[PDB]
Amino acid sequence: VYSYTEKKRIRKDFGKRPQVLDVPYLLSIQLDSFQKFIEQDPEGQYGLEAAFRSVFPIQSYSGNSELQYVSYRLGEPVFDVQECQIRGVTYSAPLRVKLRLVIYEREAPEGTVKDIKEQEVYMGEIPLMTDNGTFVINGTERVIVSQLHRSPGVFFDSDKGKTHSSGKVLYNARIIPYRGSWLDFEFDPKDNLFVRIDRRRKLPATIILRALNYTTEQILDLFFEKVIFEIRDNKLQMELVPERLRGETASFDIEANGKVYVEKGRRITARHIRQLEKDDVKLIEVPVEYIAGKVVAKDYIDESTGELICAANMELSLDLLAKLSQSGHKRIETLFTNDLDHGPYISETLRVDPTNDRLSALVEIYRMMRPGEPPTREAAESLFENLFFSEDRYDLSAVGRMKFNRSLLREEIEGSGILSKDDIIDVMKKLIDIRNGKGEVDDIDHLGNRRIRSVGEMAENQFRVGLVRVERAVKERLSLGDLDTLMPQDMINAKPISAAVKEFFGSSQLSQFMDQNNPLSEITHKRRISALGPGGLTRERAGFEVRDVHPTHYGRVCPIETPEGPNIGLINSLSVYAQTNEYGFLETPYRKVTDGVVTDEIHYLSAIEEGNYVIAQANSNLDEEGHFVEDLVTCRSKGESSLFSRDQVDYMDVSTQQVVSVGASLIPFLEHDDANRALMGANMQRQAVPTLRADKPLVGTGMERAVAVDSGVTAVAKRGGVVQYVDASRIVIKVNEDEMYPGEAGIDIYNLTKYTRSNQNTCINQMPCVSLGEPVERGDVLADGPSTDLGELALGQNMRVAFMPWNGYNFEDSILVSERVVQEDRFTTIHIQELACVSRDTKLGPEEITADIPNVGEAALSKLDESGIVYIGAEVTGGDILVGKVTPKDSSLRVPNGVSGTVIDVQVFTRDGVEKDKRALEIEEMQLKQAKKDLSEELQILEAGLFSRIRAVLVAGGVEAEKLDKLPRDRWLELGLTDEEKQNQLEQLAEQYDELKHEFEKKLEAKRRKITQGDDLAPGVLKIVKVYLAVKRRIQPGDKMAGRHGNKGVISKINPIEDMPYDENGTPVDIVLNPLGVPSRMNIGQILETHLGMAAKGIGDKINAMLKQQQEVAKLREFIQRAYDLGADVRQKVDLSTFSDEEVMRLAENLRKGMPIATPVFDGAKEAEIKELLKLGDLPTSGQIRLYDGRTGEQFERPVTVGYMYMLKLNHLVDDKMHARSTGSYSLVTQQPLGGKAQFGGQRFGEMEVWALEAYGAAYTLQEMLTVKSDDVNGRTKMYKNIVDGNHQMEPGMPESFNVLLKEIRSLGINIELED
Amino acid sequence: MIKGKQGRFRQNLLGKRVDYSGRSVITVGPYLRLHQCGLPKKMALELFKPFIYGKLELRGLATTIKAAKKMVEREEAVVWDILDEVIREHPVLLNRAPTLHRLGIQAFEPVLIEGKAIQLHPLVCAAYNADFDGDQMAVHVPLTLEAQLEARALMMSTNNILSPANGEPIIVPSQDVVLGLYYMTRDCVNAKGEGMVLTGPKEAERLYRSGLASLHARVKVRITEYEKDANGELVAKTSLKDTTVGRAILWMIVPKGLPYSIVNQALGKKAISKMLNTCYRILGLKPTVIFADQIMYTGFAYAARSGASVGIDDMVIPEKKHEIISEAEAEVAEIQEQFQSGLVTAGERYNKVIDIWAAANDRVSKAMMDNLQTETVINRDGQEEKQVSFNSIYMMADSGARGSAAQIRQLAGMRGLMAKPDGSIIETPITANFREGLNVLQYFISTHGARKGLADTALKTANSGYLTRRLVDVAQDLVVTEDDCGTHEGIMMTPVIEGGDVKEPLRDRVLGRVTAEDVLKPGTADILVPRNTLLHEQWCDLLEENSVDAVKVRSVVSCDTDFGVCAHCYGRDLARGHIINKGEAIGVIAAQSIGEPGTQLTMRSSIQVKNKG
DNA sequence: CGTCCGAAGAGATTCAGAG
DNA sequence: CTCTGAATCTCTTCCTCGTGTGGTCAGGACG
RNA sequence: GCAGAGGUUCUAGCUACACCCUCUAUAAAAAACUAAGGACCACACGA
Ligand SMILES: NCc1c[nH]c2nc(N)[nH]c(=O)c12
């Protein structure tokens, strides 16, 4: 059983590995995140309501009043998504927040509030994510890429090597809050622990401990174990534990009860330790020497006077021992230091620490955090509390809590956002243990340590910033504001909260211009993850390690799809099967294995949970009972690939494609090609421009269906039904009655978007793929989008490829193309360029849009209308006038040179209060008529569905259907109908229809009035006319064309068809490629791709030959069935006996061009299968076909490789990149070339070029380029006169930039002058 | 504003944007000569617009300059004829976007082309280090007569045959022409036309076009080679030489001066580079330019006629590969058993696994080479005879056209051990070649190193740019100011030997360097080389015959010139094959020469005696 | 109608324990 | 016992060009 | 603009480097003469 599109054309699949989980919704990451951002959340977790609860307690300080958030309601959009794009306004929903303000009793907070003020206030306008997944923010679709940032929590870094220049590793502990100040503990070379906050100057680690109100004795107790020393007549023998002896050599005789277990100065062997436990003696004799070499852990005060014999953390001198002995301190508690196990890091810091109490510690903290500020008691306390113990200033997210607890081995999942004393002391203890070697440093590159912040979380954070701003405002206003006098709407200003969100959405490092260049590009950009942004790494800060891919990326982040450039690995693409966890971590679906059987149930595994388990290989043979065929299966356990027993492994890869992203998955035979070439090819696919005709990839992965359906370029069937009416503009489906809802339902109208200006200046064209009467099931693709063919993503054209070097035209990576390709318009692409002319309120009168321009050619005026706007569909050329803007007494917009084509549409926009001109009135009238026609059409189709349902049960009720037909069929209500089960529904339908006629008339009036009212415009502009220019760019020599495998090349020459090589059958090969790119750039897949394409076209040619003649349906059916079986345990095993003859005929007609092949990424076809498929056709199994030169007619030796490889034209057409200027506008620095193609600017002759001419003997050329071609107010003018006079004499002069330098340095205060 | 790249002195003063300049993508267009290039018709009209206006005024077609401006907008046929006249002899500088070396900017004679893309002659594409992957070249138009003469004299590609860094041809044929010549200059044991006697290379060409004899069949054909033994006189010698038909055909391309021995070999890439170097050394530069252009034309034509093609069946997977892999896996299992038994430690076991996997990789590579390079067995008028295999991929690798033996070993043999990004070698290598399907884990391991290499290459480019800038700035103020200092002091030049081998022969090191003093023969009191003589090829060979192991030579550090360098001390220009001319800026030349390879540079007992002596 | 309101490398900067 | 070399604390750079997209202050009354 | 004035045209046209013509109180007979405001920052891509 297959979907109708699949029935229309079913892709042969060579995948030998069954899939247990379908491809997840590719845009789920953005959609679900934004939905949770705006979803009403009753528990107030992960939503706008969470932010409202966190930021709106609003208890006025000394104001005995409170304003509390109640509920937030999203307002309906002012304009639709397409309307927002056209008008240029953002697609946003006004925020209706129910706010209740209560006033307590006079100076009685415990008293009940006297009255309430509950009302709804507009609080900013939040952009709405489209159903596609984008944001329209200034009339242009914008996609907010998800950010990969260091997960909040505690992380430990070695910082080994360069630090201390001695090989010693200086472990540091970093606690990164989600919001707040960083807390860093770092080790000194002298083993001194230092604390550093907010990357400021380092401070002794004891200082923060004192800020926790910890005494020195408490610090020693926390960070050190205490040995007990006992005063004895026998040289002060002390109680001791045998375990602490292990690991160090004894400096004394170990004797208890007169039995010397270990002698003086003897290394303690394992046997000695073991017998020490076996004796279980509590006291161990210690001489005066060993006790001397110790540091006391607690203060000991003499009994005589109470003064301390020893201060906390002071070395035990012999006289100190005598002083405490005469004092009588029998029990002595001193720190135990074992250089192997327990180092005196805390003790040494305490010695270095000069702040002996909490007061001095907070004084130091205040001085460091705010230098130059006189410290104060309360001020320092408040500063520290805000730094690390205030909820508003410092926040750890729930993900931060979980990561912190897991890193610190805490049992509880979540604690409190603010740091606690126990948390800090545990962090320090863990850092000490890492210093001792216990444990290991956390890995920053570990993907478990890097959580993904999606659009919802970022929007929540920016909304929180706006909320704290408005909270500051409202708390300042309320405190001094009159009670019960100002409404909350008066108290709340929506400007800051609106501005914060608008700034984040419109302009941010993560807020990016969506590239609509390709549906694949649209999908990839939405799923794309960038480490850049706020709270993230930059281009220069990031080192190699962050860019390098950590083996934990497997199944979460695509290794292959990383953009080439400065940002290599900073930007990554989400793997196809991955989806973010609740806490934001990446998860990979994995199949549970009980003992040997791979149970079909899938459990999503986090990166940290991936490490402990062992995961089976994707290419793991199965017995069809779930047991691994191989006794030992290759598996990855802890980032290491090693074979394991079949019983040992407990998880398996869900599918072979989970490693790659959406872009990489589309590449066929990706397994065979090198990783670098796969990366390049995946990058090229995004830049592929939609061709004039969308042609199915003759060879493809098979995921094109998923990309097309999940992308918004093509409309899908929300409800299955029959196609009532289909048009290029719009498609009408009549839904089946089961799909149809009982009331006001039965039709689904999809208004297909015609040629529209893409974000990358391409064309978004929605082409219907169905006709009348075709049964369309739910979820079916009604109309193909750009680069979409019958519901399959069609980025480019499958074109004939010959791998031979042809007269050097394909020299390094160049590509020949036959004139046949241009003749058939195979790669011709429509480009939409939008030119905007703005009339402005200028001085000495405003600019006049009316064609009052004088001193213009009559031919130019002819294209313009009476009002000066160019007629729709008038072909224009660069330099031709399009509008009639007149300088107030030549300012009219003209086509940019090198741009040509018909004007598809003119969207005149009028400011409110500005009268529309003749043409603008007509344009508005056309829009009003079109809106009226569309609303009348929607009413008519709604009426047709309503009439059908009413008629169906109109006969019931014992009234003749014909009598009701004589009455208006909708208004049968005048004729009484006996009550029946559906009579109430029919009465509701007719009453609703009568009310709907008024409501729809009001809706028509409102829609027309929206067009009639002058659109809001930027201030100071009377009107803006948006003229859309549409051009059919064709294949031009130098145009960049690339295959999916990364063999990028320019079109060297448009070779004539007869010159192109031809095989024995005489078919000329369309594209000739250099085979030398294959060996070095090891994209051997393109050769396999070419062979498989040849096999598919052989199948298609046999099908076409059967179709050209009149062949029995049984013969064609059996041949296509042979094609679709081909043995080799193919997963599909489709049976054509199910298909009807008409369905088989339609399938054959679709296959007449060729038979598509679904070759998955890593379970794709082997070479033997391709050989068998070639054998199915008449083609030689070798894949080499004898070829003849087109020009000479002489056969080539060594038969060449010929087959159809998918070919992509890239948007880097020569038309855009070609530029030149003789003379043009200059800048303020008087550098005559402005630079850039958009302005008439010249190429930068930079430092490298200067040194290049400098190494040569070039002096006159260098002087000329520097002076007369760049900056000389006199020389540039002179040289022009000399050249037009015919003599090439250069006046050197002095560059203007040098005078600029002189005046700037002289302004700086340095006397710089040119002395003679 | 004053300082940094953003700062004006770096931003504009050092590099000023220029008028009469333009960019476009690059196109091959082999039909062009080396000196000339392809220029778009529309681009030329904009670039040469002032020259066009002047020519129109001189013609009188435009009475006024305003009329001339209108005529250029009209683009009438008369304007295009005027453009042809201006384009005829105004050289255009062509500049690659990263100008690492002086060769990056080379002037060319512009030729009007219908296409909108600049065409660069194929031989000079290697010099530019540019490809056709949508590379873009800035094109500038020198204006003054001094500028045009400077361009034609020095900037033009024909002048810079040899790279400034090393006295070797920088126009060495790179990709397709070398493959075509290698197919042409190849021998087969048996092919149609074998054993024939041919009157001359013209007859060889006629037979090949008739198809009676293939390119690579051996025949007994006379060759009339002219010998330059008489200085400035050509002595014709005609002899019967047993060579292939293709080599005979290529002999027509070679000028008369060069000997026939150079063509008689396989003529790969180093071979053709040596051929060009010998042509430059023996004949003039202009004959060398004509020879190079003819080489490119013939190579492209015979490569196209050859029909070289890469295919899956062309790749050969050794039958011994699976057995070797199974033996290596059994050895690995044995080492794992030893580790479980405790005989070998974890580090020692890892080392042993790495060693055995490396040995297995070497054996797989050797078997693949044995079954790739000489695999073809061809009947030879009798018993079948093994011959060097004509496999296209092996032809590409052996000829040096593109891709070394390592790439082919990765292609058809097992890829081998791939180190994980930190630097440690993964215990389990990639046993699957690119022809076979790679496992997902294998692909992940490979992509580790691939991404590592890409990022390291990006930072290679960054650090190379920084180093080049620093070298230019430190060595900018170096120009040849004195013809001869006369400083007897100089550095001692000797071949460098680390004991294993002579890493640098003395011939290359002292080539084109003026002797510090008289070079006496190893025989005492015999002065082979005078005190101040430039060492061309003849002198360097003469020293080799007398086996002068140590030569004390002048160096730039030795010269006593202040704010300048001795012309004799610097030695040969290394690009024009003669003593450095006075006033040339050697400092920037050397800074660019050192900086440029930085992209290629990777960022990351018993005394055995080789031979008796 | 103006018009006021990372990384790395290197050179100072301590600083210091030692002959 | 007053300066060792040594640890520390700021300062400067970190390619080279294209091509497209976008977003933008100071500083509002006021006589 | 010989100095003052006006000027065909081929935006504007005794200076921008400018230039020329005719004429005697004020415009009108004629051809040859000449280059325009673009600052910064982010994102993405291509080499
Ligand atoms: N720039 C001077 C000028 C303005 N109008 C002119 N008309 C003519 N015939 N001649 C000129 O020289 C001028």
Ligand SMILES: [Mg+2]
């Ligand atoms: Mg390139």
